[PDB]
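Supplementary material to the annual report.
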Amino acid sequence: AEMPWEQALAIPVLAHLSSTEQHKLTQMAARFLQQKRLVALQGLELTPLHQARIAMLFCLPVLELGIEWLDGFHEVLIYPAPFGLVHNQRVVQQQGPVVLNWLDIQDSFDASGFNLVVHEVAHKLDTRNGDRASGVPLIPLREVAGWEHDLHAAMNNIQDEIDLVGESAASIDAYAATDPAECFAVLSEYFFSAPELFAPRFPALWQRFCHFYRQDPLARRRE
Ligand SMILES: [Cl-]
Ligand SMILES: [Cl-]
Ligand SMILES: [Zn+2]
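Predicted assembly:
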């Protein structure tokens, strides 16, 4: 009968939401499931708990933006397992389904920095204008120059760290230095899953993300 929403919420990435935020996320996730299909492929079977959690992850980055920011897709295709040279090629080609895999979704529940759902949502936010993926989501025109400035500076800063300490030890996943679209998506993963690594390191860009997402995940870890 009922979806197991309360249980669904009990995962690390969602653990610091206020009770208000948890109830609002639950309503949006319920609406998500009304409006979009989660299509499990190749024999994968997703339980109501899994379905509920996946919906809530999709809704997290748009909690204060609204479900209409996810209008760029009708379906989500979920493979059991993973199959990013072709990934980024695909990214910069848009109404297509979001494509995920279950192994990476399960990792997306923890508070590690990695979140494939948030990553893919970020790409949809970047292209919501109908524009090609540029690492810049829908923001006022006067801010674009400054956004791109701060984004590209962060990308070079990530490359500098990779050159100094190596890929394995780098503070932000090295994939962020790939290109601006990937930088936005990877830093969006940190914004929600590991804000403590983002905010101190890129204060100007952090402020821009807070204002764009209308959320402050670091402050939320305070009460
Ligand atoms: Cl269940
Ligand atoms: Cl968090
Ligand atoms: Zn990507």
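The pocket of chloride ion (ligand 2) is lined by residues 16, 111, 193, 217 (CB under 6 Å).
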